[PDB]
From a paper:
The bacterial relBE locus encodes a toxin-antitoxin complex in which the toxin, RelE, is capable of cleaving mRNA in the ribosomal A site cotranslationally. The antitoxin, RelB, both binds and inhibits RelE, and regulates transcription through operator binding and conditional cooperativity controlled by RelE.
Two additional crystal structures of isolated RelE further show that the C-terminal helix uses this motif to adopt multiple, defined conformations. However, reinvestigation of this structure using better data collected to 1.8 Å revealed that although one of the three molecules in the ASU is indeed in the monomeric form reported earlier, the two other molecules dimerize via a symmetrical domain-swap interaction involving helix α3. The most common interaction is characterized by a strong salt bridge between Arg93 and Glu14 in addition to multiple contacts between hydrophobic residues such as Val86 and Tyr87 (left).
Numbering used by the authors: 2 to 95
Write the structure that this text describes.
Amino acid sequence: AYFLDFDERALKEWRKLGSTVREQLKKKLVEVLESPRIEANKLRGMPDCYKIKLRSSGYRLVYQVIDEKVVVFVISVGKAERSEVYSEAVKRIL
């Protein structure tokens, strides 16, 4: 299993999340820690990035897998609408 870390800005997003949505993402995030490279969820663009999707929120969590630190690094949590959550993730990695 992998350890967990958050970007400072991503952790704030996490705590601002509504209760029901956070719990939904939390269950999936905990599953992710057991084995975080889930090829179906791999994001295009820079390597080692994956998403967690909800069927109808439509909130998203973006994380980077960092093997050298055995860590899942949460970089962005927010809305898929207008690709907000994804553009922020790229911005925070650069």
